[PDB]
Amino acid sequence: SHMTFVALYDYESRTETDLSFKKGERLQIVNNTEGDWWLAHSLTTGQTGYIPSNYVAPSD
Amino acid sequence: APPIPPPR
């Protein structure tokens, strides 16, 4: 079970409830990793929103 | 960068 991920690519929000993030940011799961859109909190920027699961990998 | 998954 993984709850901390690292952005592989820059992501710009496409709807307001998305989280924008830059490559290399650490992103903390708020609830769970079910489905394709995960509610996450950036440990870099402090912002919270949905992230696309294919843009991140476990912080290894 | 890949296309997004199916949107909410």
Outline the fold blueprint.
The complex is a heterodimer of chains A (60) and B (8).
Chain A: E1 4-7, E2 26-29, E3 37-42, E4 48-52, E5 56-58
Antiparallel strand pairs in A: 1-2, 1-5, 2-3, 3-4
Chain B: no helix or strand
Protein name (chain A): Proto-oncogene tyrosine-protein kinase Src
Organism (chain A): Gallus gallus
Subunit structure (chain A): Forms a complex with polyoma virus middle T antigen. Interacts with AFAP-110. Interacts with GJA1 and PXN.
Largest beta sheet: strand ordering of chain A: 4-3-2-1-5
Distance, first to last CA of chain B? 19 Å
Shape of chain A: globular
Specify the helix fraction band of chain A: under 10%
Determine the structural class of chain A based on helices, strands and strand pairing.
mainly beta
Proper CATH architecture of chain A: Roll
User: What is the CATH homology-level superfamily of chain A?
Assistant: SH3 Domains
Rg from Cα of chain B? 7 Å
Looking at CATH, which topology of chain A would you report?
SH3 type barrels
